[PDB]
Amino acid sequence: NLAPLPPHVPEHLVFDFDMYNPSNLSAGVQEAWAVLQESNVPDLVWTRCNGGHWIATRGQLIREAYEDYRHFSSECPWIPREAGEAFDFIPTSMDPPEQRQFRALANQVVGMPVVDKLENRIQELACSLIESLRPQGQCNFTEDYAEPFPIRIFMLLAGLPEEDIPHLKYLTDQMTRPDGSMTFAEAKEALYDYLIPIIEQRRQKPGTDAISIVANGQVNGRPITSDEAKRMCGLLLLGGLDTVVNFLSFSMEFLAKSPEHRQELIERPERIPAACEELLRRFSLVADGRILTSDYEFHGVQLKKGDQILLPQMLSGLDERENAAPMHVDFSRQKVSHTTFGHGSHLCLGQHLARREIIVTLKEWLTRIPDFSIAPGAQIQHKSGIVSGVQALPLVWDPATTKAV
Ligand code: HEM
């Protein structure tokens, strides 16, 4: 339950927040995490949950910490510590300067240039799935669209058989929102067990798929090793199957309850990209951290070498000191401040692919099924972790109010 308070941790800074099951979850995950920004909560607190760790609750500290990799290392970014210690994905488990070379390689598979190339493909898949659902007048968004849309795109880019999705998806979810069936370490070894043969095979016979590119790639001009390729492909796998997938659901859940906001985008489609950013802020969902490389005093608090600190990317944009009325969605928001895709040298590499998938989904969906709502009686439930999500999303609509495009 609660780990005994280390001697150096001030008693009054204790706030037992459980990132894998926050007290106020029933009100929504973001709402649940936002409790950390209530009037009497300090900028930096310590929770005795999940082994004990600090938590920066404000955008100011979160951004500052992510910028200072000398003090806050990516070496151990996962909580609990056991997970953080087993965590060796590339390039996230690395700090500059060595981290850099691997980011460049990762960009060969997800960089903007590559994304633009995927535009037509992405649109075709979205239109395909939406048009197929359109006449049915209902669907559980998570399994009918949120999951298949981005996962298939990734699997295709990676050149991996779709039959493998169920196993892979289970493993990725155990790494972000474990149900207890396995530790982060076990899910990782299983993910690596899956990739090892595939990488060797792609290295012997170079292809044009994401795996081949990484596996036969160069970093700083030298050949990447089989282990490095594995550590990187594993991370790309995680991004492709458990980020956009979840974000889309938070977004659609909101749109299914906001006729006014839907009409805005229906009226002026050119506002979709802006709406996408506001949604990325309001429904931010990632939260990992760093480990102190040495004793360091941060904002009046004595952090000790080895201490873990959660720096919730999700909280920055929800911070009222960053955005007035943070909980309100305003597609017209003048300055949409957020760190949804991270901050610092570890800025999300899949962010361009993510925005494309989000915008295409909004554009293609609202143009065919402008009017829809949450299936009556549905008690939408959220799930919390390194990456938060929605359990199920039952949507309904009158087929007569749709349009084939
Ligand atoms: C809504 C979608 C997404 C969000 C909010 C998101 C968020 C993030 C965040 C917050 C980080 C920083 C972690 C840290 O600093 O420890 C990150 C890193 C990363 N993400 Fe994204 N992610 C998304 C989608 C994706 C996708 C689809 C992919 C791959 C296809 C991806 C690949 C990566 C990679 C490779 C990194 C590591 C960068 C490094 O360590 O230098 N992400 N992402």
Ligand SMILES: [K+]
């Ligand atoms: K580690």
